[PDB]
């Protein structure tokens, strides 16, 4: 209700199951939601172009992650294409949604990880997309970016994701980081492709809980940081809503996401996929 009027459709199990399989209603509902995209002219900062994968997919100013070191007063140094994202119940800064780093933003991305104390990164890029959708921003073993030693301590190979256990060191303080590289993102978002995404969501929220009180923001990224990123975060919020309230409101969750970052859940097929994932989870909980 701050940047646009929020919409809601509270779904119980039966309606959730049926809604997932009604593409005609899904498209009518989806295309009524404002994208809440930022006018590109909002960001006329010299050199900004080089920091963006897509010139029209920009962070909404009110929720933008600003890089406060080494110059908070420099519009370029402080810029990253990223937004703080509210979680379930409107909890502030549960996630940060960001574009997949490009060659020129690899160091900015690690500046953001350190500033935010981020304990978990969720990367939604398939292996054959590693060309123009994400740069390999992590090292094979070790790399230093702006006084911070990043060490890949272990690679855990699973069916649907690669988990990297990363160490971050600067001076005397050392931090842990979990990097979830999901490699099972489907082109055809049929119900049979929903289980790996659901598994990833469950694993990440459990790892988030294990960080203990006041978990620092969880970074989530895909190419533009809105489509797949939007799905992941909406699914994560709705799983907590279903467990707490016994209902799901994908519509209201999508509206809340869009208020934080324009275009979250970019396509109708992504919107339906979220319904397939939530319908699947509801059946699993029911046992
Ligand atoms: O960004 P999106 O809007 O979602 C857009 O639809 C979209 C979704 C996926 C892809 C994509 C990219 C590379 C390789 C593949 C593989 O063909 C593949 C991999 C894993 C699985 Cl599990 C499957 Cl089924 C199929 C798919 C491209 C574009």
Swiss-Prot record:
Domain Tyrosine-protein phosphatase: residue ranges: 26-281
Signal peptide interval: none
Active site: 222 (phosphocysteine intermediate)
Binding locations of substrate: 187, 222-228, 266
Location of this chain's protein in the cell: Endoplasmic reticulum membrane
Function according to Swiss-Prot or TrEMBL: May regulate the activity of several effector molecules involved in synaptic plasticity and neuronal cell survival, including MAPKs, Src family kinases and NMDA receptors.
Family stated for the protein in its record: Belongs to the protein-tyrosine phosphatase family. Non-receptor class subfamily.
Protein name per the record: Tyrosine-protein phosphatase non-receptor type 5
Residues included from the entire protein: 282 to 561 of 565
């Amino acid at each position: 209700n701050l940047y646009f009027q929020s919409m809601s459709r509270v779904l119980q199990a039966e309606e959730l199951h049926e809604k997932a399989l009604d593409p005609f209603l899904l498209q009518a509902e989806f295309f009524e939601i404002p994208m809440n995209f930022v006018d590109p002219k909002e960001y006329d900062i010299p050199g900004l172009v080089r920091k963006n994968r897509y010139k029209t997919i920009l962070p909404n100013p009110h929720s933008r992650v600003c890089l406060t070191s080494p110059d908070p007063d420099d519009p370029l140094s402080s810029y990253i294409n990223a937004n703080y994202i509210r979680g379930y119940g409107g909890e502030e800064k549960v996630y940060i949604a960001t574009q997949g780093p490009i060659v020129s933003t690899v160091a900015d991305f690690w500046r953001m990880v350190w500033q935010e104390h981020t304990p978990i990164i969720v990367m939604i890029t398939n292996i054959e997309e590693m060309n123009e959708k994400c740069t390999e921003y992590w090292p094979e073993e070790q790399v230093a970016y702006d006084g911070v030693e990043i060490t890949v301590q272990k690679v855990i190979h699973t069916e649907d994701y690669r988990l990297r256990l990363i160490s971050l060191k600067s001076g005397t303080e050392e931090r842990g980081l979990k990097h979830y590289w999901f490699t099972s993102w489907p082109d055809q978002k049929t119900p049979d492709r929903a289980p790996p995404l659901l598994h990833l969501v469950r694993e990440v929220e459990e790892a988030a809980q294990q960080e203990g009180p006041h978990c620092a923001p969880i970074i989530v990224h895909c190419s533009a940081g809105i489509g797949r990123t939007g799905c992941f975060i909406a699914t994560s919020i709705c799983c907590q809503q279903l467990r707490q309230e016994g209902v799901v409101d994908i519509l209201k969750t999508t509206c809340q996401l869009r208020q934080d970052r324009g275009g979250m859940i970019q396509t109708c097929e992504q919107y339906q996929f979220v319904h397939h994932v939530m319908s699947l989870y509801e059946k699993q909980l029911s046992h």
